[PDB]
Every structure is written in C-alpha cells, then in structure tokens.
Design a binder for this molecule. Structure first.
Ligand SMILES: CN[C@H]1CC[C@@H](c2ccc(Cl)c(Cl)c2)c2ccccc21
Ligand code: NA
Ligand code: NA
Length: 497
C-alpha cells in the first residue's frame, strides 16, 4: 500500500484539502451575517465540541482501515460493523465525494479560466456608480458560465470555459496519477507555501487600499465587530455548526481515505490538530482580511451589509474582479486572486477524487493508472450535467453537501463509537499519538458530538423547485445504485479468491 513520505507532507496535504475557496469567501460572509466577531463564540464552540472530535474519528477510522488495505467506507464500515447494512451505509462515503467532484472541478476550472483571462488582459474595462461597474463583470462571468438568457434551464458555456475544464481535469489527473507521495504530497509541499505567499501579498496590498468611499480598516472594522444580540438566534448557532463541517471537510469520507495512507502506529492526534489549525488560521487571518475589507474599502461601509447579503460567490467572481479593474495594476491582482483560488481548489479536488481511486485500487484491484483514468472519465461525464443543465449544480450540492455530509458524519460517529465500541475506538484514536487526547473528549465524542449533529439534523429537515431537478435526482440516484453494484462486485471477487 502507498504511504505518506514525511509528516510535514501529511499535514500539508491534509491542510491542502481543507483550505479552499470557502476559507476566503464563505467564512467571512457567514461571520458578517451572524454577529461579526460575536460569531466567533458559537464558531469556536463548534470547533471544539464537533469539528475536532469528528476529525480525529475519521483519522482513526482511516488509519484503522488503512492498516488492512482498505481506504474507503464501504470496507471500513464493515470492519467496524460486520453487517449488510454497514456496507450500504458506507456507499455514501464514496457517493458523496463523487457527486461533489462532478461540480467542484468545474468551479475550479473557472478560477483557472479567469486567471488566464485576467493575466492576458481579456477582462471588461468599465465605465461612476456601483451598478455601472458591477454589470460589466456580472455579464463577463455569465458569458463564461453560459447563464440562460431565456426561460429554458439550459446553460451554454463558452468554448473557452469548456476547454479550461478539460485542461483543469488534465491537471488533476497529472497529480493523482503519480500517487500519494510523489504526487499529492509532492504538490502539497509546493502549493501550500505558494498559497500562503499569495494570501499574504493580497492582505498587504488590501490594507493599502484607499478610496473616497473608505479604507481597509473599515472592512476589518465592520467584519469583526461583535453583534452579541444575534447569539440569541439559534440559526446563528446552526450556521456555526454547519460551517465547521464545511470548513474542515467532515462527512466527505476524504479524511478517512487520506488518513488511510498514514502508517499503523504513526500519530494522528497531533497531526490532525495541526492541519485543523492551519485551516482555521487561514480563514480568520488570511481570508477575512482580503475579501470583505477590499469590498467595504471600495464601496464604503454603507454597503457592507448589502455586499455580505449578496453572497460569497458574487463577492469573489463579480464584486472583487470589478474592484480590481479600478485599482492600480489591478489586472495583475485579478490574476493573483484567481490563481490563489485555483490552487485552493486543486489541493482539494485531488483529495476528493482519491476516494474513488482508492476504492478501485483496494477493492477492485485496479492499477493506479486505470483507477485514476476511470475516475476521471466518470467525473468528466457527470460534470456535463452540471455544465449544461441549469440548477443541476444546486441540486447535487444540496443532497451531497447539505444533507449528505451531515448525515454521513453522524453515521461515522455511531458506527465507530457506539457500534464498534467506544473503548476500542478511543484507543484507536490515541494510539501512536505524540500527544494524548484529553480525557474529557471521551464524553464529547460519545454524547455531545452526536447530539449536536442530531439536533442540527432535525432543523435542516424541518426548515427544508422545477421539474428538471428530477433529471439531476435521477442521475445522482443512479450513481448510488451503480456504486452499490461495484461494492457488490468487490465482495464477489473476494469470495472467489
Ligand atoms: C472542506 N471544505 C472545502 C474543502 C474541499 C472541497 C471538496 C470536498 C470534497 C470533494 Cl470530493 C471535493 Cl472534489 C472537493 C470542498 C467542497 C465542498 C465544500 C467544501 C469544501
Ligand atoms: Na476550510
Ligand atoms: Na485546497
């Protein structure tokens, strides 16, 4: 079996997975709409009661199953719980990341495309007034995506956007085809420093932004200013819990797959806590000091709520490029921005597609070349549903990463800590640990964490379309069935040998 080369590379690949666009865009927006700096109160709490424990558990299940040549949850859930239903539940942790991949790489391709467009100067040049600056970039993006002009739910992406997507995929394959150590890890040692560099440079440049409308200090002011009255809102306490899942990457079965390349007695306690911290520092320090400040600085704190309510996607693909077309040499800033975002995705999409690659290697005994190509061929095909069917993206994401990861996360808890047994699990986590997990986390992992996951699981089901959504539902259900069939073939090949 493949293994990570250096302890550093492990943490960087682990941090590379969790460090993403959401760090720079989604996190700053959620904080601004949920109490500013007061949002740190329920967020830090959720980082402690939910995010850290669940991460250790996936590191635990990962390493536990990796020692036996199995990196995926259809196998690992059967090792924690020898059952017919356990294999079926494990399919989700191979289904989820395959669904997300169908649309993540595509969104990743966009940043690559914009980075290229910005670098060569192929960007809109307005003109005065805010809607006079934003509209040229709102249209620039929509011509790239192919946003429907008519009533039809059909997207018509540019030939360029499509080609970059092939190129983007090709880039992903290159890294994945070289393996865990000479590929993902080797890249994680290049990307993460390069990432941090671009991040700091933008932070420095952003703090030097001054307009008649405001300064970067006003952005950091508005953003981090605590609104403790919003802490009364349960929804804020829910946004915090959902965000932790999102930021860390829990419930994607990727940590489990990635941790399955960690050696049997190698530390997973401190290493994970490091990668977890790298992601958080990336968010509160680097991320919340570029996007929100730069917007408030240019449009004034009088629009700060309007900008936050405009969404994270707008902030990074429409709002910030429009601001860069109005700054000194900002055509190159546009490039550094979309190139910062490209790596943030590439370090996460190589981690996402490994779950399928691991399954084809471990369970169907395919070579690494075939496992990588066939996974690519599957992702490339399914993305056409995302590229051409309007709102197909929202549908896949809602199920996979809105209900799916939260459900599957509570599944990992119960299977590893209630079915497999808490004591056997607790030992599995602490073993080989440089530092030992605090004795108090035994109770958190057993009650508090699955409680939080459960009471959240109740509200997102109580709180929550066209007809074309059935097309996407049809396809992604058909994915689950097909993956059930491969798990079935995997267990019929094993009885013969
Ligand atoms: C974990 N937070 C980021 C990390 C990578 C990125 C991600 C996660 C899983 C996969 Cl399978 C892929 Cl391809 C990509 C992602 C997706 C959705 C939501 C959040 C995030
Ligand atoms: Na994150
Ligand atoms: Na990443």
């Amino acid at each position: 079996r493949e293994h990570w080369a250096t302890r550093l590379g492990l943490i960087l690949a682990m941090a590379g997975y969790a460090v993403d666009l959401g760090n720079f865009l989604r996190f700053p927006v959620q904080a601004a709409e949920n109490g500013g700096g007061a949002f740190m109160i329920p967020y830090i709490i959720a980082f402690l009661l939910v995010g850290i424990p669940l991460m250790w558990i996936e590191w635990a299940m990962g390493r536990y199953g990796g020692a036996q040549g199995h990196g995926t949850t259809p196998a690992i859930f059967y090792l924690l719980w020898r059952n017919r239903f356990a294999k079926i539940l494990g399919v989700f942790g191979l289904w989820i990341p395959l669904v997300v991949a169908s649309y993540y790489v595509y969104i990743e391709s966009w940043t690559l495309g914009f980075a290229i467009k910005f670098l060569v100067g192929l960007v809109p040049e307005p003109p005065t007034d805010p809607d006079s600056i934003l509209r040229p970039f709102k249209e620039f993006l929509y011509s790239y995506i192919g946003v429907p002009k008519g009533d039809e739910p059909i997207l018509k992406p540019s030939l360029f956007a499509y080609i970059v997507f092939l190129i983007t995929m090709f880039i992903n394959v290159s890294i994945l085809i070289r393996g865990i150590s000479k590929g993902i890890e080797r890249f994680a040692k290049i990307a993460m420093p390069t990432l941090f560099i671009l991040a700091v440079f933008l932070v420095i440049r952003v703090f030097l932004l001054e307009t008649p409308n405001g300064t970067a200090a006003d952005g950091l002011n508005f953003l981090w200013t605590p609104d403790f009255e919003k802490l009364k809102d349960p929804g804020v306490w829910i946004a915090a819990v959902g965000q932790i899942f999102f930021s860390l990457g829990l419930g994607f079965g990727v940590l489990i797959t990635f941790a399955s390349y960690v050696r049997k007695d190698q530390d997973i306690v401190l290493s994970g806590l490091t990668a977890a911290t790298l992601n958080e520092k990336a968010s509160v320090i680097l991320g919340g000091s570029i996007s929100i400040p730069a917007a408030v600085a240019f449009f004034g704190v009088a629009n700060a709520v309007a900008i936050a309510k405009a969404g994270a996607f707008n902030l990074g693909f429409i709002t910030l490029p429009a601001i860069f077309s109005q700054t000194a040499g900002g055509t190159f800033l546009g490039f550094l921005w979309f190139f910062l975002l490209f790596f943030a995705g590439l370090t996460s999409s190589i981690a996402g597609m490994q779950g399928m690659i691991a399954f084809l290697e471990d369970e169907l005994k395919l070579s690494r070349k075939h496992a990588v190509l066939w996974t690519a061929a599957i992702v490339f095909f399914s993305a056409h549903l995302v590229m051409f069917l309007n709102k197909s993206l929202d549908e896949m994401d809602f199920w996979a990463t809105g209900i799916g990861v939260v459900f599957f996360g509570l599944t990992e808890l119960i299977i590893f800590f209630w079915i497999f047994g808490a004591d056997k699990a607790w030992e599995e986590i602490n073993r080989g640990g440089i530092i030992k997990v605090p004795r108090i986390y035994y109770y958190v992992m057993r009650y508090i964490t699955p409680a939080f996951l459960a009471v959240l699981l109740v509200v997102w089901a109580r709180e929550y379309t066209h007809w074309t959504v059935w097309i996407t539902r049809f396809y992604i259900i058909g994915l689950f069935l097909f993956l059930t069939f491969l798990v079935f073939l995997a267990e019929r090949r094993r009885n013969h040998e």
